[PDB]
Amino acid sequence: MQTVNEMLRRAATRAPDHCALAVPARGLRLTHAELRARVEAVAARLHADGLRPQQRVAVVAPNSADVVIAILALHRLGAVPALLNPRLKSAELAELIKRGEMTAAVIAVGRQVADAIFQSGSGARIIFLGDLVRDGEPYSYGPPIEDPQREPAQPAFIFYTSGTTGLPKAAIIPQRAAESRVLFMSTQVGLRHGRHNVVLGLMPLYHVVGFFAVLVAALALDGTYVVVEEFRPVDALQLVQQEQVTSLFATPTHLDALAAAAAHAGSSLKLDSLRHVTFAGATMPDAVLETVHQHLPGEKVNIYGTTEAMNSLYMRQPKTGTEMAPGFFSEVRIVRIGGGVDEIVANGEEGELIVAASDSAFVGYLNQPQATAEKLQDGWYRTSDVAVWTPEGTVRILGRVPDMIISGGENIHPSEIERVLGTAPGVTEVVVIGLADQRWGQSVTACVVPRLGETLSADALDTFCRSSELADFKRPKRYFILDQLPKNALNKVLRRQLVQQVSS
Amino acid sequence: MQTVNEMLRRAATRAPDHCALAVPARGLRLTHAELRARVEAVAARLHADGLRPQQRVAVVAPNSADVVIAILALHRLGAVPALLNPRLKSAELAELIKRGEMTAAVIAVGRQVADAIFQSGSGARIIFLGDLVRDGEPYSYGPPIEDPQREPAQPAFIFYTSGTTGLPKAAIIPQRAAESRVLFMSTQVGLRHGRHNVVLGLMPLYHVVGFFAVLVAALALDGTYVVVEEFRPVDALQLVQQEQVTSLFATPTHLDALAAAAAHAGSSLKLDSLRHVTFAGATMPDAVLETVHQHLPGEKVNIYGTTEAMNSLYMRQPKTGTEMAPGFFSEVRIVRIGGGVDEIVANGEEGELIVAASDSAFVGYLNQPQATAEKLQDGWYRTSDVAVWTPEGTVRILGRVPDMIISGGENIHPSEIERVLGTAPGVTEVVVIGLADQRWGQSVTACVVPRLGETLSADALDTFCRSSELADFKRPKRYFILDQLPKNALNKVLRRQLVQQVSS
Numbered sequence A, B: 001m002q003t004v005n006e007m008l009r010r011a012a013t014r015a016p017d018h019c020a021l022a023v024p025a026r027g028l029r030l031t032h033a034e035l036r037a038r039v040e041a042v043a044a045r046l047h048a049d050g051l052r053p054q055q056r057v058a059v060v061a062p063n064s065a066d067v068v069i070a071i072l073a074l075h076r077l078g079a080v081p082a083l084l085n086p087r088l089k090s091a092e093l094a095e096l097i098k099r100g101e102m103t104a105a106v107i108a109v110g111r112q113v114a115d116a117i118f119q120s121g122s123g124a125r126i127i128f129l130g131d132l133v134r135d136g137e138p139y140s141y142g143p144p145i146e147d148p149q150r151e152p153a154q155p156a157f158i159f160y161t162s163g164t165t166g167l168p169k170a171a172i173i174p175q176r177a178a179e180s181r182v183l184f185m186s187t188q189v190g191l192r193h194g195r196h197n198v199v200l201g202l203m204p205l206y207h208v209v210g211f212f213a214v215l216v217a218a219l220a221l222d223g224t225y226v227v228v229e230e231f232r233p234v235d236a237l238q239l240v241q242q243e244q245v246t247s248l249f250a251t252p253t254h255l256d257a258l259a260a261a262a263a264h265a266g267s268s269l270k271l272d273s274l275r276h277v278t279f280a281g282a283t284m285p286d287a288v289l290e291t292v293h294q295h296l297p298g299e300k301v302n303i304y305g306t307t308e309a310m311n312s313l314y315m316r317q318p319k320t321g322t323e324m325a326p327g328f329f330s331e332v333r334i335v336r337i338g339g340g341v342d343e344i345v346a347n348g349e350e351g352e353l354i355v356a357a358s359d360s361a362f363v364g365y366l367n368q369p370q371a372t373a374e375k376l377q378d379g380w381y382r383t384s385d386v387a388v389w390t391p392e393g394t395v396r397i398l399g400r401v402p403d404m405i406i407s408g409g410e411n412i413h414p415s416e417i418e419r420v421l422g423t424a425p426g427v428t429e430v431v432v433i434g435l436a437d438q439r440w441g442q443s444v445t446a447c448v449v450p451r452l453g454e455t456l457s458a459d460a461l462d463t464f465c466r467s468s469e470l471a472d473f474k475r476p477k478r479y480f481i482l483d484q485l486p487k488n489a490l491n492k493v494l495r496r497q498l499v500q501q502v503s504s
């Protein structure tokens, strides 16, 4: 295998004096040889404080040069970084660090997060990020340390994933998973080795795409990673010109902003250097996509993946954000929902997407054997996504199994109804849920938020739906117009709490 | 890891009804699902005849659909194919099959080769290729067989390499080596996954490039491999148009022919679909390269590699065939000649190119522990090539360590002098060797073959050399004009026998 550290170490030998990491707003520039030395120093400093291999260290920080240095330093040492979204609630972050028996936690949030975990009964050395490294410049003591032996199945990094239940599950990513979690950006997306590679880091480092597909890939290809502490669409496009960005990987939301900005700021900004615009577009509306083809340069590549298996499907120059086909490393099936992994659907029926659990796959959820059992079955990973095989021989992602509504025999996907109702005039936000019914089985219900100052009516929305493409059985039976939808801290609809709020 | 079989098996699930293998002259077309079934049938047939995993089977055949089927069948079974050049002498092929204690040998050469090995005292079941599979159509009996467990360090394939000594050494290629032996065609050369991939198979299957970089890559990327039984330049260009070839990998000699043909047959042939023209150009003269840029389409990529480690250096759009830089998977050093692996040269001095021995590296030479010891040292593979670091921070390949001449302090590379003298009028072939001298140390000597009917003189060639770029000390001290140069069967100059022939 080739580990993260080993990928970066090799790169460092090939391109020691080439720009590795840049914060152009902060004026910070680090070469491959320079970054490595800082990684080596922070590692040996963390080791001098008694940190050992296989020990789990939580990392809670927004994107920065220093957090990259820290995460890679922790990895070079032998420790296992557990990367956590800083936008999570203080109590949630504290519980997950307790849950995971972490040795220490590297933090660059407020003092309230530090207090919360300090008084949670955890046993985790609070390490402030600025104590370890600040503005690329590390605080370092002790001699150069040893590079420990790494085994393929051995834990390397921990990333968190939002299950149906409650608290995020901690997916353990083995050493051998790094290569294919990087190289799909080459085989699917078309990146190649070379110092031409300039990669805009719009994706958070706590997410696997942000880490493997963007940071590590950028470095492993002997290119440069452009740090972004905070996203702003016109600023991001300026960095594209100013830094000669070759590829960007971003969410549907960023790309909506970025393409709209690429309209207001037209041929003022030169975006020619950008050759790859990549995204997870399963939940990207057809309008945003159309906007992206019209107004943004470079090859557009839609990417389907999960924290647990990384990349499973893709599409070059996509006409629709839902339909994709498996690429290199991947093997996929669609099976009857709730059935065994060998129960392939009638090739027109709907079922759960499962993907082979090989090199890139996680080795389980930390301290959650039951959840692991529901997800890793007989060499397959269960996505929990509903899909169908199309006439063109491709896979169309319909929605999540837990979000699926069934109203009297016919399966119904709220994401479809949400896209239609979201185009209705005066609608700013819509979630469709199924209320319990003992006649239809489940009654499809729309919960709709009006635009500022506007009023909606159940009648007008029904009339709108009746004009749309929706088959009769899919039309909502009931509407609730709401001031707001209850959402967690980060930052999605609670389809359990809403259903309860809809009753009493 | 991801083995050859496992790469091809996965591809088969992703693109079962897509064209996998084509012999357009013979009208033969095989899809991924179809090829796999034939691979499965020939495997189970070979197993029904008592062949077991880890058993070594020699394969001696020119390129064909059937030999691809056979090699992959043998691999799917668990056996270890030992791929041997059919142009080798009967006695040499027989000795190497004895040397390697092969269980059986799959042959599609004359009866003389079959007789030779039959009466060599080997113990190897002579299997004619047409007994196993003919025109894609297999001869099959027995039930479907088991897929055996494969370990990373375990032997998978054996390829032969021409050492300095005599008989070709048998390099053992481990299971874990296949991925990076394929994926460098993505990271360095820029191939991506997709059914657009149409790959012209001009490289012999007995060579690692021909096998991993061309055949396996073509299939593993869900593309098509275009079989060629016999190379002809105008015919090869026709297949480029007719089959919409996206990439070709070929020798300097093919590319000389192909580009010259691309002149005589001009805009008659559409070569637009061709996007990658790849080659090992270390020994490609500057004229052929110039010709290749002027007259052939697609991105030109120079590739340096060895049977033992696969890809170690490369160059996009090369201006010179000698200068290259390491890509993904690779780590390289230049060390003092004959010294330890940690003896880096003064970054302007000449030394031996060594490359890190990692995943892609061979695990030794079969039944040759001494040779293995000279080549795998402390985690590095010794190329036996002399190189220097250039001002631009790249590696310039100068020539082979065994071919190096030293004439009174100054190191001299016969390949340089050969390129100059090869441009001299009336020269059809030139080899420069160093004769033993106890005053200069070694005396540089040119052995030169005149063009048909032409006469050369030592004086005229000396005058030509004196007009050229050659520094005074590099000029040959003596000339031997010869009717022919003694060459082995396949098909290179014997720098030991010539030196002897030059004396008495």
Ligand SMILES: O=C(O)c1ccc(Cl)cc1
Binding pocket: A208, A209, A213, A280, A303, A304, A305, A306, A307, A310, A311, A312
């Ligand atoms: O979590 C995701 O959405 C995700 C994870 C991995 C990939 Cl490659 C793409 C998307």
Ligand SMILES: O=C(O)c1ccc(Cl)cc1
Binding pocket: B208, B209, B213, B280, B303, B304, B305, B306, B307, B310, B311, B312
């Ligand atoms: O043997 C060779 O010349 C050779 C082997 C491997 C590569 Cl990638 C390139 C060239």
